[PDB]
Paper text:
Gelsolin is the prototype of a large superfamily of proteins, responsible for the assembly, disassembly and scavenging of actin filaments by means of its severing and capping activities. Gelsolin is organized into six homologous domains (G1–G6), sharing the same gelsolin-like fold. Each of these modules hosts at least one calcium-binding site and the presence of calcium induces both subtle local and large global conformational changes. Conversely, the presence of mutations in plasma gelsolin is known to be directly related to a rare form of amyloidosis, hereafter referred as AGel amyloidosis (AGel, OMIM reference number 105120).
Here, we report the crystal structure of the second domain of gelsolin carrying the recently identified Gly167Arg mutation. Contrary to the previously published gelsolin G2 crystal structures, two molecules were present in the asymmetric unit and during refinement we observed a discontinuity in the electron density corresponding to a loop connecting β-strand β1 to β2 (hereafter named as the hinge loop). Indeed, such discontinuity was owing to an unusual conformation of the crystallographic dimer, with the N-terminal β1 strand of each monomer contributed from the other polypeptide chain. The dimerization interface between the two monomers mainly involves the swapped β1 strand, comprising residues 158–166, covering a total contact area of 2375 Å2. In addition, the two stretched hinge loops interact in a pseudo β-antiparallel fashion, contributing several polar interactions to the assembly. Contrary to this, the stretched conformation of the hinge loop adopted in the Gly167Arg dimer better accommodates the bulky residue, eliminating the torsional strain. Therefore, the Gly167Arg mutant triggers the conformational change to release both the torsional strain and the repulsion among the basic residues. Similarly, in the Gly167Arg dimer structure, we could only model up to residue 257 and 258 in chains A and B, respectively. In the other G2 structures, calcium is hexacoordinated by Gly186, Asp187, Glu209 and Asp259, but the last residue is disordered in the Gly167Arg mutant and, in its place, we observed a citrate molecule in both subunits. Citrate was derived from the crystallization condition (0.1 M concentration) and was H-bonded to residues 186, 204, 206 and the mutated 167 residue.
Numbering used by the authors:
A (entry chain A): 154 to 257
B (entry chain B): 150 to 258
The structure:
């Protein structure tokens, strides 16, 4: 009998969906590969890891400004910070910052 | 009912994360299946053609390499050659199967 080849095509694609999920208020929840939003009512702290991607950064900005504008009527301030510039108000709530995992 | 109404603030933390899974799925063998934001593997038996769009990410490229080598080493017992191409360098073997290349969308939309 003759040998056959089945001609095939694979598409290799990473899922695009970017989720914002509520997680425990703790440094435990942080990793340097994503973005995080700490909502404190009058103040909203947006924190992006050094290995976060541009879709996560965009989504984080939409979520933080969305809370400020569509939930606080614009009566809230968004503070953007990163590794090493975390403001005292984050540190009061989360406590002293430890080493964070790189991702996942 | 005189009251002193004290506002409650619930402190919350949100994680913003793009899903990590890279999928590899069979699609119709056609240029109509291609886009410039993903990677593709055209499996022609003895020859496996790996093609990465200009807007693909490193995880799609790594997964395409892993799947191509899996086809080569598992399903073909090593009796196959992987050829890497990209936009503008598609070999004649790809054009023979897919026909002349049209303009491709930049991504999925
Ligand atoms: Ca991430
Ligand atoms: Ca892609
Ligand atoms: Na074969
Ligand atoms: Na080539």
């Amino acid at each position: 009998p003759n040998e056959v080849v089945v001609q095939r095509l694979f598409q290799v694609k990473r899922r695009r969906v970017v989720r914002a999920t509520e997680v425990p208020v703790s440094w435990e929840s942080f990793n340097n590969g994503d973005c995080f939003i700490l909502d404190l009512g009058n103040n909203i702290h947006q924190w992006c890891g050094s290995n976060s991607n541009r879709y996560e950064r965009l989504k984080a900005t939409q979520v933080s400004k969305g809370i400020r504008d569509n939930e606080r009527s614009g009566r809230a301030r968004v503070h953007v910070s990163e590794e090493g510039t975390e403001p005292e108000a984050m540190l009061q709530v989360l406590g002293p910052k430890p080493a964070l995992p790189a991702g996942t």
